[PDB]
Design a binder for this molecule. Sequence first.
Ligand code: VO4
Ligand SMILES: [Mg+2]
Ligand SMILES: [Mg+2]
Length: 136
Amino acid sequence: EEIIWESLSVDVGSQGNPGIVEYKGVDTKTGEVLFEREPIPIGTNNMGEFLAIVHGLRYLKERNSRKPIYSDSQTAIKWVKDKKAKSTLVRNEETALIWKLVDEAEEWLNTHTYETPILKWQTDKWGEIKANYGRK
RNA sequence: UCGACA
DNA sequence: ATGTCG
Ligand code: VO4
Ligand SMILES: [Mg+2]
Ligand SMILES: [Mg+2]
């Protein structure tokens, strides 16, 4: 299987886990940053990966784009497929912002239709995903 | 008992 | 190290 360059790549970035979470989506071909989330004080890697895909889904749908989305997160891909984020992050006053975004993301998935293929970025064959933050 | 993706 | 799934 080859890389579908005509696509959107998303990825999470964090400082600690759980810790500060952010994410962005980029054009897989050029690397142009199409959107980037404002750092979230506290959240998990998988929540961020999940929010990144849903944000890409809405980004593409508003523009009537049928391009697929690449993510390197097996967990986030499954959560999106089930339209349910199974995070273990403790629900409390500290993790309110991330959980709210996560709940709203889920809500969006349960209130909208889309055919966007959500593809697994084969990191071991193609190297780091184009929207990556972390060290290689 | 791990294996895997982050 | 910690977050999650097969
Ligand atoms: O802009 V919306 O996709 O929330 O309908
Ligand atoms: Mg990732
Ligand atoms: Mg990354």
